[PDB]
Every structure is written in structure tokens, then in C-alpha cells.
Amino acid sequence: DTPTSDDLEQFAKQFKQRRIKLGFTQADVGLALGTLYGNVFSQTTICRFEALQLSFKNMCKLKPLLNKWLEEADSSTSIEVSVKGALESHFLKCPKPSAQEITSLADSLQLEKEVVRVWFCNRRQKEKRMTPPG
Amino acid sequence: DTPTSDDLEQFAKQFKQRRIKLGFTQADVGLALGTLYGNVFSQTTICRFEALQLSFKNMCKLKPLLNKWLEEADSSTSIEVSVKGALESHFLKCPKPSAQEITSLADSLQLEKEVVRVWFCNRRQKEKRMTPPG
DNA sequence: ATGCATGAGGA
DNA sequence: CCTCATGCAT
DNA sequence: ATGCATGAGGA
DNA sequence: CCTCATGCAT
């Protein structure tokens, strides 16, 4: 049976609180999941978990693995600023542009088409985090 | 004879440009200064150098050491947001408060006195960077 | 890329 | 205390 | 703490 | 192409 979104908030809040009190960094925890359970994770992922900056499914996948570490540790190419806001505006107009709208947006802002395609992919995926940028 | 501030801007701009083209990260360069010259530096320091976020003296100290690497590589406790703006306001009023103004500022914002003393130390020291936050 | 930190050295 | 060079952790 | 990225897997 | 989990580099 799955946690609620409230369960994950409170778990993340208490996980961070306890990780600090034990004297571990985010990078430490991520490495220890590799050491103890053969499933390493980066500082970036532990940080996002604590901020709920991951999808609900991802949050649910990591929670028991982080609960394991907690139980166990208790025992011891750059978009300009002006261009960035332009990408926003079109994202509210339409957040999933075609490969044709992307390729034209890339010239009107003088970005490579791949840069724009990936930027939209990422901005769509932040919208799906449990705590999105809004 | 010492570089001008313009010399250091252009050197930092060209250093970053060349470091990327060689395929090295900031952390790589910092470690290589230890490897090659027995003077290791952190990713943080290389990053600040490229952004001129260090004092003129510091910038001058690091430049020849980074010019060495370039020549050689060519061959191969958290202040709330609202509280933060309050610390600013008083910094313009007076940027070097006494240990008595510090200790009272610490209670009126419910921070530890050491936190406020260190915050002022750091905010004074950013004012001395070649590219300050302003 | 940066917030908060440390410690050597000095008035 | 401070300045100052410097970095861990995020 | 996060901007830009990759690659496995799927419609 | 996309979604999605994930991280290097800053």
C-alpha cells in the first residue's frame, strides 16, 4: 500500500532533519545506498528527494530505500536571461510544441533546436514534480 | 609588473573559453594545480576566478598559476528569505556593526550572534570582489 | 553557482 | 574582533 | 541547489 | 519524437 503525498512530505522533512543530526551530507547518503544496497545515487537526487522535486512515483520508489539507510545509520550552452523568459511565455501558450514550432522557436531566439527541445522536455518534467516551480 | 583589472577580465574570459574547449571541468583544473604544482584548489575557487568573484590581490595571485596550467594543458542554519533582506537594509545603514549592535540584531531577527557576525563578514568581503554583487 | 563557514594572521 | 584566502555542502 | 543534459523505453 | 529516472557540472 502506497504513501500519500502528505506521508512523503513528512518523511522527507524528517529524513533531512535526521540526516543532518547524524552528520551525513547528501552525497554521503547517495554513496551509502550503493555501499549498503548496491544502488548508488547522486547528491543531486538526494537533494531533490528532500525538496520533493521528483515525481510521485520516483518519491515512492526512493522512500523505502532511504528508510533503510535511516534505520541502518541510526545504529552506528547556457540560455541568456532575456531568452529564458521568452521560453516561459510560449510554454504557457503551448507546453508541447511540435518539432516544427521548436525548430522555428530555435531561430527566433537563436538557439540550437536541440537546446529548445530539451528545455521544453525539462520544463514539462518540472511541472510533474511533487513540488513544482510554481 | 601587475596586470590591470582589464587584463584580468580578458584573461578570465579567455581562460574559461579555453578550459571548455580542452574538455576540462572547473574541479579538474583545481585538482590539476595540485597534481602539477603542489597547490590544489577547489571547484569553488576556479569558478569564482572565472566570474572575477575574488579580490584583486587574489585574482593576481591565481592568474600566473592558471596561465601555467593553460600553457601545460595546451600540450596534451540557513537564513530565511525575509530575514535576509533585513540584513541588507542594516548593511547600507552601517556595514561594520559593533559586537553590541550584532548581538542585538541577532535577537531582533532571532539568529545566533555568530551567524550575524559571519554574515556581515561575508557581505563586506563580497563588496571587495572585482565583480561585486551590485 | 553560491550560502554559510573556517582558520591564519593582524591590529 | 577583523581581514583574507579558501571550500564544504547544497 | 539547479541548468542543461543523457539514455532506456515506449507510442 | 516523447516520458522518465537520473547526474555532471556549475
Author numbering:
A (entry chain C), B (entry chain C): 246 to 321, 506 to 563
Sentences from the paper on this structure:
Indeed, Brn2 is involved in the direct lineage reprogramming of fibroblasts to induced neurons and induces neural stem cells. Brn2 forms dimers with Sox2 in the context of neural stem cells (NSCs) reminiscent of the Sox2/Oct4 dimer in ESCs. However, the dominant motif targeted by Brn2 is the MORE motif.
POU3 factors such as Oct6 and Brn2 dimerize on the MORE with more positive cooperativity compared to Oct4 as they encode non-polar amino acids such as methionine at position 151 of the POU domain contrary to the polar serine of Oct4 (29). We could generate crystals of Brn2 bound to MORE DNA diffracting to 1.9 Å resolution. The POUHD and POUS engage in direct intermolecular protein-protein contacts mediated by hydrophobic residues (POUS-S6, L9, L53, F57, M60 with POUHD 151M; POUS L53 with POUHD T152). On MORE, the 5′-ATGC site is bound by POUS and the reverse complement 3′-TACG by the POUHD. Yet, in this configuration, both POUS and POUHD are bound to DNA and engage in direct protein-protein interactions.
